Design a protein around this ligand. Structure first.
Ligand code: ADP
Ligand code: ZN
Lengths: 210, 535, 103
């Protein structure tokens, strides 16, 4: 997961008020293009390419009905309740499959940098970052557990495979550091790091390259 | 003699037994201790001091084999190969040999099963006979127990006789010592593909043969087990657990006493009934005494052991119990969280349940003196272990079996790379793919299988490509790479078309497309390097 | 199993003379007698094997004839027996001679 930059707030959230209005009422096609600007057409938590996608309340509408029509609270997550059943990570699992959790002990990707908490191994596990204790460890652990970032075999598989595809190219660049002057080699690495913004699982590919 | 005495004191079991037979105390105890002594491991598992396993097998002019020699592992051996390589033939050969032990444990001079003149002789055998030679091990006292089964073809230039005396001699030791004092006995079983068979709901009324200890040897090497016998035996155990026998004896004793008082009071009409009740009491006491005399585990404990085994080994089954529904005893199971009858189980679940239940039953019956009867000794042959199992179960099946039955020698056949990924290469014996029946030794694969990727096992061990060769799309990424290499790494009109085809067929986030993208990127970088070097 | 000379004494004094046994036996004899040194036969089998698709049926027949010749050669003096063709013919003659209105 990525550090997201939440920039501008859409007009429609002003109109609807919590208590009176329900989430079934609000029009969703107004909300999406601002999220798609933020998130780049990728999921908030896992970084798949969004195709079946829903608006997710980071703090849910049951436990926090005050935090409902709040631009901070909304994120575009992979999965859909409507089109098919039994989705097993991210938004849908946080509610259904991840049972009890304190929402305070989760990484919120708009507020925080995830990179200090999470580490992506090239073998395709996501793990807590090197040298965390107490609360910083507990956030890393619970984020991994609640969004099901290792436990979804479909996701674990896809990420592992995506990284293992590029590991010849990583290996090969860091041989050529010997031969070239700095500014050409630094341009080469800048380029590869430019491409992976178009790619799925961009954080995991970054950790492989950098 | 003095020589036998020396060898016996040196720990030779046969010499000790011969001295026992001729003098018919000390020699008996020595033989019994050789068979019974063992220790509990650091892991809490009982381990016999003198293990029993098949060490070596040799096949001469048997079915497809002119000559084959196999060394077997003490714990687990897996035989792999293409269809028609003779994997099943190997298990059949072993089972026939084991039949000679079983026959002689049951009855003095019992005969095991013989090689078929029609099917077991190789079709183009010059010598027109077949031999199955096996060597067994039973502790340091008996390092070699050689057996040979032989059969000559119909035209009969000379009769070739089987040599089975060592099997008989060893089996005699088990039989005779057991007769004097109950000992634990080895389990021998074959589970071939015939274990897949529909379940009959109609459970046979208790004639009472299923409770006899040596019913454990009844069609053990037939290939299917007897799951019907399990169900009868399990219901029997349930009924006996609900009904205490000694209270029935006490109640019967009280009834006999009351009836005796009535007869003493002048009512001669009830004398016939008194005699019947005295008979019933004597029978109940005898059963109790026989139960007491057998040193056998309590029925409650037996039931619990088997239930635990089944639930541990069979993933979809969390509970098994006997219900009295209407006027009939019915076995029920909690399968995938729902209560169902055995007849409602899927074929895969039932087949696997049948195997484990049968094996557990036999082990409980043959190992009454062990705290955990499933830690008994024996040799179990399983053909096509993956039969009816989904990949998820294939990843757990070997681990679960070995955990439930730690001292059984398992000799198994498989076609599953998933199964092989859980087993060490030392346990694997592979036929070469181009074997025209004149391979002398089965050997271990070159690659380590345990913990290895499935794709690698398929290619390196089973000689199967990761992608299906008879599908055009299976070649596209390979062809794409070749086109890139042919055009000095630049994406030309032809390479672009194929790229678009890959994208269209496999999709935008497909592995195949990502590999293609990777190839483009790496080749561009290689070319940039080449240009910098040229300048 | 092959037919042994002393099968003639099997069930001779009880069990003899069942129609089904005859019919089975007779058809068997017919199939065998539908269509000669061992060395010559061995040479013919070898020549036919070298030629071997249309001659495969003939090769199988000749291999059978060779096996039979070897068996007869290997078979003991005490079990000496007439050819299956002759056996069939004698039985046919017996039946037609004895059984009224079967010609
Ligand atoms: N008597 C025989 N003579 C020659 N080949 C035989 C004989 N019996 C079986 N075979 C061969 O053995 C193979 C069957 O071996 P089998 O154990 O059933 O194979 P699998 O490894 O699939 O279990 C077939 O290819 C068959 O041609
Ligand atoms: Zn997601």
């Amino acid at each position: 997961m990525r550090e997201l930059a939440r920039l501008e707030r859409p007009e429609i959230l002003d109109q609807y008020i919590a208590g009176q209005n329900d989430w079934m009422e609000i029009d969703q096609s107004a909300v999406w293009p601002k999220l798609t600007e933020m998130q780049g057409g990728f999921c908030a938590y896992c970084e798949c390419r969004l195709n079946r996608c829903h608006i997710e309340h980071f703090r849910p509408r049951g436990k926090f009905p005050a935090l409902t029509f709040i631009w901070n609270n909304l994120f575009g997550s992979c999965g859909d309740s409507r089109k098919s059943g039994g989705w097993s990570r991210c938004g849908i699992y946080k509610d259904n499959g991840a049972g009890a959790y304190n929402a305070d002990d989760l990484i919120k990707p708009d507020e925080e940098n995830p990179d200090d908490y999470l580490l992506f191994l090239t073998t395709g596990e996501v793990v807590p970052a090197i040298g965390l204790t107490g609360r910083a460890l507990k956030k890393a652990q619970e984020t991994i557990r609640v969004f099901n970032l290792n436990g979804d075999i479909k996701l674990f598989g896809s990420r592992r495979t995506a990284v293992q595809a590029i590991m010849p190219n990583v290996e090969y660049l860091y041989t050529l550091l010997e031969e070239f002057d700095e500014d050409d080699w630094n341009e080469m690495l800048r380029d590869e790091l430019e491409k992976i913004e178009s790619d799925e699982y961009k954080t995991a590919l970054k950790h492989a390259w950098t | 003699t003095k020589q036998y005495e020396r060898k016996a004191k040196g720990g030779n079991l046969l010499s000790a037994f011969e001295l026992y037979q001729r003098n018919s105390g000390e020699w008996f105890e020595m033989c019994r201790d050789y068979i019974q002594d063992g220790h509990v491991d650091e892991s809490g598992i009982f381990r016999p001091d003198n293990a029993f396993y098949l060490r070596r097998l040799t096949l001469k002019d048997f079915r497809r084999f002119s000559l084959l020699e196999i060394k077997l592992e003490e714990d687990l051996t897996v035989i792999i190969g293409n269809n028609g390589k003779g994997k099943t033939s190997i298990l059949y050969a072993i089972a026939k040999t084991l039949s000679w032990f079983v026959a002689n444990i049951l009855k003095e001079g019992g005969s095991g099963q013989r090689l078929s003149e029609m099917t077991d002789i190789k079709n183009d055998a010059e010598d027109r006979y077949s031999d199955v030679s096996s060597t067994f091990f039973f502790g340091k006292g008996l390092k070699s127990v050689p057996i040979r089964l032989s059969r000559s073809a119909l035209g009969t230039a000379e009769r070739r006789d089987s040599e089975v005396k060592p099997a008989k001699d060893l089996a005699d030791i088990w039989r005779v010592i057991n007769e004097v004092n109950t000992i634990n006995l080895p389990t021998f079983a074959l589970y071939n593909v015939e274990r897949s068979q529909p379940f009959n709901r109609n459970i046979k009324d208790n004639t009472g043969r299923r409770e006899e200890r040596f019913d454990a040897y009844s069609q053990t090497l037939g290939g299917a087990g007897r799951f019907d016998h399990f169900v009868e035996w399990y219901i029997y155990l349930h009924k006996r657990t609900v009904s205490d026998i000694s209270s029935s004896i006490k109640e019967l004793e009280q009834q006999v006493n009351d009836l005796q008082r009535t007869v003493d009071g002048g009512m001669v009409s009830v004398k016939s009934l008194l005699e019947q009740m005295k008979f019933k009491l004597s029978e109940a006491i005898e059963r109790n005494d026989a139960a007491v005399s057998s040193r056998v585990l309590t029925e409650s404990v037996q039931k619990s052991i088997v239930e635990k085994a089944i639930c541990s080994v069979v993933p979809s089954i969390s509970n098994i119990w006997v219900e009295m529904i209407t006027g009939s005893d019915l076995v029920k199971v909690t399968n995938d969280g729902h209560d169902v009858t055995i007849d409602q189980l899927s074929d895969g679940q039932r087949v696997f349940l049948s195997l484990v239940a049968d094996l557990a039953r036999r082990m409980v019956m043959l190992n009454p003196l062990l705290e955990n009867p499933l830690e008994g000794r024996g040799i179990v042959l399983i053909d096509e272990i993956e039969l009816h199992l989904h990949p998820k179960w294939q990843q757990e099946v070997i681990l679960n079996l070995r955990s439930a039955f730690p001292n059984i020698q398992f000799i198994i056949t498989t076609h599953s790379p998933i199964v092989l990924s859980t087993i060490e290469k030392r346990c694997i014996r592979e036929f070469e793919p181009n074997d025209d029946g004149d391979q002398s030794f089965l050997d271990s694969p070159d690659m380590q299988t345990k913990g290895s990727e499935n794709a690698q096992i398929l290619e390196q061990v089973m000689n199967v490509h990761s992608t299906p060769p008879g599908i055009a799309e299976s070649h596209w990424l390979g062809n794409f790479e070749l086109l890139l290499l042919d055009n000095s790494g630049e994406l030309d009109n032809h390479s672009q078309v194929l790229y678009d085809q890959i994208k269209a067929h496999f999709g935008i986030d497909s592995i195949e497309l990502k590999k293609a993208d990777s190839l483009i990127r790496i080749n561009k970088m290689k070319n940039k390097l080449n240009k910098i070097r040229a300048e």
